[PDB]
Scaffold this motif. Structure first.
Motif, PDB file in Angstrom:
ATOM      1  N   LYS A 126     -83.440 -50.218-109.247  1.00 55.74           N
ATOM      2  CA  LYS A 126     -82.168 -50.921-109.370  1.00 55.74           C
ATOM      3  C   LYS A 126     -82.084 -51.752-110.644  1.00 55.74           C
ATOM      4  CE  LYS A 126     -82.512 -52.623-104.979  1.00 55.74           C
ATOM      5  NZ  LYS A 126     -82.201 -54.017-104.561  1.00 55.74           N
ATOM      6  N   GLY A 127     -83.220 -52.150-111.205  1.00 54.46           N
ATOM      7  CA  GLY A 127     -83.246 -53.072-112.319  1.00 54.46           C
ATOM      8  C   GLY A 127     -83.282 -54.532-111.932  1.00 54.46           C
ATOM      9  N   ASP A 128     -83.545 -54.841-110.662  1.00 55.68           N
ATOM     10  CA  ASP A 128     -83.503 -56.201-110.141  1.00 55.68           C
ATOM     11  C   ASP A 128     -84.521 -57.133-110.788  1.00 55.68           C
ATOM     12  OD1 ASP A 128     -82.774 -58.343-108.527  1.00 55.68           O
ATOM     13  OD2 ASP A 128     -82.786 -57.150-106.693  1.00 55.68           O
ATOM     14  N   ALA A 129     -85.606 -56.605-111.341  1.00 54.86           N
ATOM     15  CA  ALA A 129     -86.716 -57.423-111.801  1.00 54.86           C
ATOM     16  C   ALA A 129     -86.467 -57.950-113.215  1.00 54.86           C
ATOM     17  CB  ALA A 129     -88.010 -56.618-111.733  1.00 54.86           C
ATOM     18  N   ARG A 130     -87.473 -58.621-113.773  1.00 55.91           N
ATOM     19  CA  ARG A 130     -87.530 -59.115-115.138  1.00 55.91           C
ATOM     20  C   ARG A 130     -88.556 -58.317-115.933  1.00 55.91           C
ATOM     21  NH1 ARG A 130     -89.935 -63.798-115.421  1.00 55.91           N
ATOM     22  NH2 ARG A 130     -90.587 -64.414-113.314  1.00 55.91           N
ATOM     23  N   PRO A 131     -88.400 -58.228-117.258  1.00 58.71           N
ATOM     24  CA  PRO A 131     -89.339 -57.418-118.055  1.00 58.71           C
ATOM     25  C   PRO A 131     -90.793 -57.841-117.925  1.00 58.71           C
ATOM     26  CG  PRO A 131     -87.391 -57.926-119.329  1.00 58.71           C
ATOM     27  CD  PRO A 131     -87.285 -58.737-118.075  1.00 58.71           C
ATOM     28  N   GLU A 135     -86.789 -51.553-119.152  1.00 57.01           N
ATOM     29  CA  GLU A 135     -86.180 -52.756-119.712  1.00 57.01           C
ATOM     30  C   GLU A 135     -84.669 -52.609-119.818  1.00 57.01           C
ATOM     31  OE1 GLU A 135     -89.777 -54.484-122.553  1.00 57.01           O
ATOM     32  OE2 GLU A 135     -88.764 -52.587-122.977  1.00 57.01           O
ATOM     33  N   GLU A 136     -84.205 -51.405-120.147  1.00 56.10           N
ATOM     34  CA  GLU A 136     -82.784 -51.148-120.319  1.00 56.10           C
ATOM     35  C   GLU A 136     -82.063 -51.249-118.974  1.00 56.10           C
ATOM     36  OE1 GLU A 136     -79.369 -49.980-120.140  1.00 56.10           O
ATOM     37  OE2 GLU A 136     -80.016 -50.842-122.048  1.00 56.10           O
ATOM     38  N   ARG A 137     -82.675 -50.704-117.918  1.00 54.66           N
ATOM     39  CA  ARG A 137     -82.123 -50.839-116.571  1.00 54.66           C
ATOM     40  C   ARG A 137     -82.072 -52.297-116.131  1.00 54.66           C
ATOM     41  NH1 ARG A 137     -82.764 -46.403-112.604  1.00 54.66           N
ATOM     42  NH2 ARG A 137     -83.736 -45.480-114.458  1.00 54.66           N
ATOM     43  N   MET A 138     -83.125 -53.063-116.427  1.00 53.12           N
ATOM     44  CA  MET A 138     -83.111 -54.482-116.084  1.00 53.12           C
ATOM     45  C   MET A 138     -82.008 -55.218-116.832  1.00 53.12           C
ATOM     46  SD  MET A 138     -87.194 -55.251-115.927  1.00 53.12           S
ATOM     47  CE  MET A 138     -88.280 -54.068-115.138  1.00 53.12           C
ATOM     48  N   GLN A 139     -81.788 -54.857-118.098  1.00 52.37           N
ATOM     49  CA  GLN A 139     -80.701 -55.457-118.861  1.00 52.37           C
ATOM     50  C   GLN A 139     -79.352 -55.164-118.214  1.00 52.37           C
ATOM     51  OE1 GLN A 139     -78.445 -55.035-121.931  1.00 52.37           O
ATOM     52  NE2 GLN A 139     -78.752 -57.187-122.491  1.00 52.37           N
ATOM     53  N   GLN A 140     -79.136 -53.921-117.773  1.00 53.57           N
ATOM     54  CA  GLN A 140     -77.870 -53.604-117.110  1.00 53.57           C
ATOM     55  C   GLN A 140     -77.700 -54.389-115.820  1.00 53.57           C
ATOM     56  OE1 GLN A 140     -77.339 -52.161-120.090  1.00 53.57           O
ATOM     57  NE2 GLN A 140     -75.774 -51.030-118.948  1.00 53.57           N
ATOM     58  N   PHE A 141     -78.761 -54.484-115.016  1.00 56.40           N
ATOM     59  CA  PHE A 141     -78.649 -55.227-113.766  1.00 56.40           C
ATOM     60  C   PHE A 141     -78.331 -56.691-114.026  1.00 56.40           C
ATOM     61  CE2 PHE A 141     -79.374 -55.740-109.254  1.00 56.40           C
ATOM     62  CZ  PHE A 141     -79.734 -57.066-109.146  1.00 56.40           C
ATOM     63  N   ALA A 142     -78.995 -57.300-115.011  1.00 58.15           N
ATOM     64  CA  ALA A 142     -78.719 -58.698-115.320  1.00 58.15           C
ATOM     65  C   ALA A 142     -77.304 -58.873-115.855  1.00 58.15           C
ATOM     66  CB  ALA A 142     -79.743 -59.229-116.321  1.00 58.15           C
ATOM     67  N   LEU A 143     -76.801 -57.879-116.590  1.00 60.93           N
ATOM     68  CA  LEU A 143     -75.449 -57.973-117.132  1.00 60.93           C
ATOM     69  C   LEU A 143     -74.402 -57.892-116.029  1.00 60.93           C
ATOM     70  CD1 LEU A 143     -75.161 -57.993-120.403  1.00 60.93           C
ATOM     71  CD2 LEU A 143     -73.701 -55.998-119.960  1.00 60.93           C
ATOM     72  N   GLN A 144     -74.525 -56.907-115.137  1.00 64.83           N
ATOM     73  CA  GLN A 144     -73.467 -56.681-114.155  1.00 64.83           C
ATOM     74  C   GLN A 144     -73.442 -57.775-113.094  1.00 64.83           C
ATOM     75  OE1 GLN A 144     -74.717 -52.735-113.163  1.00 64.83           O
ATOM     76  NE2 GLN A 144     -75.827 -53.369-111.317  1.00 64.83           N
ATOM     77  N   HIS A 145     -74.604 -58.314-112.737  1.00 63.15           N
ATOM     78  CA  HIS A 145     -74.680 -59.379-111.747  1.00 63.15           C
ATOM     79  C   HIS A 145     -74.487 -60.762-112.349  1.00 63.15           C
ATOM     80  CE1 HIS A 145     -75.925 -57.345-107.962  1.00 63.15           C
ATOM     81  NE2 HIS A 145     -76.245 -56.383-108.809  1.00 63.15           N
ATOM     82  N   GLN A 146     -74.311 -60.852-113.665  1.00 66.86           N
ATOM     83  CA  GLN A 146     -74.049 -62.115-114.352  1.00 66.86           C
ATOM     84  C   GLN A 146     -75.107 -63.169-114.037  1.00 66.86           C
ATOM     85  OE1 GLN A 146     -69.494 -62.443-113.451  1.00 66.86           O
ATOM     86  NE2 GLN A 146     -70.405 -60.439-113.009  1.00 66.86           N
TER      87      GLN A 146
END
Ligand SMILES: CCCCCCCCCCCCCCCCCC(=O)OC[C@H](COP(=O)([O-])OCC(O)COP(=O)([O-])OC[C@@H](COC(=O)CCCCCCCCCCCCCCCCC)OC(=O)CCCCCCCCCCCCCCCCC)OC(=O)CCCCCCCCCCCCCCCCC
Ligand code: SF4
Lengths: 216, 56
Positions: A159-164, A205-216
């Motif tokens: 999902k990208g929920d984590a941090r790098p 890392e790219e997936r994590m960036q998307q998750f952090a972006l969409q969930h603000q």
């Protein structure tokens, strides 16, 4: 003894050791059964010489990669326990023990799983980790706890929920599990994660960036 | 300070100093008894990797 090992011994005795020896590179002798599955046009089981190049095998016996060779994303060359290798390595690698060891992977069972560029590479490895989580016998602490821990971390990574930073954490977890278990199922669970981190860290890392972006 | 001006001048002359500048009693200048919440950072060992205890 493995069945394939047992079933070639009478032929080896009849034709002699030398005949078997001629095939393949030195210390990688004989023939081998290959199972080509995944994103190929004709998934199949074939018999081939030991040190055959992977590209030759895929394009000759399996009909090639779905959508052409340039569509290839990754290959797991020796079953789920061997680390994946990206396309740039699969082009010249040979399908023997020593060559695939040099390619930071293994010959394993010689089961070639092909994944094209349309594959969610994180999700496939997460599915393999879930397999290992459901197959662990639970006897020893590192496998019993750490494989389930890695399964949870990989499910979050999809999902990208984590941090790098957790990526490196995950790597260390695999190293803790590897070499500290009664049998090699721990090795077989740690290696695919290590391959994914080694070759597809930008995707994570790219997936994590998307998750952090969409969930603000 | 609520002291009248003549008493202030007498105090300044007797002391020889400007007493109003540095008053011992404390008024509104002091910090409020209600403060916003802090955040309080963490130490150098709060890491997820490269942090084995035998190295520290
Ligand atoms: C020698 C006699 C000196 C002059 C008499 C005097 O008391 O002057 C007061 C007054 C006191 O000066 P201050 O020290 O600057 O005022 C401080 C007060 O606390 C500031 O005033 P306050 O708001 O604190 O009020 C306190 C109040 C409350 O005090 C009382 O209740 C006393 C009255 C009831 C008896 O006292 C008074 O208001 C009356 C003063 C005392 C008169 C008796 O003197 C002057 O205003 C001028 C200097 C001297 C003339
Ligand atoms: S590593 Fe092997 S022995 Fe240990 S829990 Fe896993 S399957 Fe069981």
């Amino acid at each position: 003894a493995n069945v394939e090992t047992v079933a070639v011994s009478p032929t080896i005795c009849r034709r002699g050791g030398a005949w078997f020896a001629s095939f393949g590179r030195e210390r990688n002798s004989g023939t081998k059964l290959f199972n080509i599955s995944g994103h190929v046009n004709h998934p199949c089981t074939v018999e081939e010489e030991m040190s055959v190049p992977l590209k030759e095998l895929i394009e000759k016996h399996a009909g090639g990669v779905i959508g052409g060779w340039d569509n290839l994303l990754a290959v797991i060359p020796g079953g789920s326990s061997t680390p994946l290798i990206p396309k740039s390595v699969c082009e010249t690698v040979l399908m023997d023990f020593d060559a695939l060891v040099q390619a930071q992977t293994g010959l394993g069972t010689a089961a070639v799983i092909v994944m094209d560029r349309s594959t969610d590479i994180v999700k496939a490895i997460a599915r393999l980790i879930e397999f290992y989580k459901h197959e662990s016998c639970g006897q020893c602490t590192p496998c019993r706890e750490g494989v389930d821990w890695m399964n949870k971390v990989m499910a979050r990574f999809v999902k990208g929920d984590a941090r790098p930073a957790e990526i490196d954490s995950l790597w260390e977890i695999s190293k803790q599990i590897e070499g500290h278990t009664i049998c090699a199922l721990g090795d077989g669970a740690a290696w695919p994660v290590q391959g994914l981190i080694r070759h597809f860290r930008p995707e994570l890392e790219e997936r994590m960036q998307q998750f952090a972006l969409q969930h603000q | 300070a609520s002291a009248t001006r003549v008493i202030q001048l007498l105090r300044n002359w007797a002391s020889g100093r400007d007493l109003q500048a540095k008053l011992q009693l404390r008024y509104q200048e002091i910090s409020k008894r209600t403060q916003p919440p802090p955040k309080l950072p963490v130490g150098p060992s709060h890491k997820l990797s490269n942090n084995y205890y035998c190295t520290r």
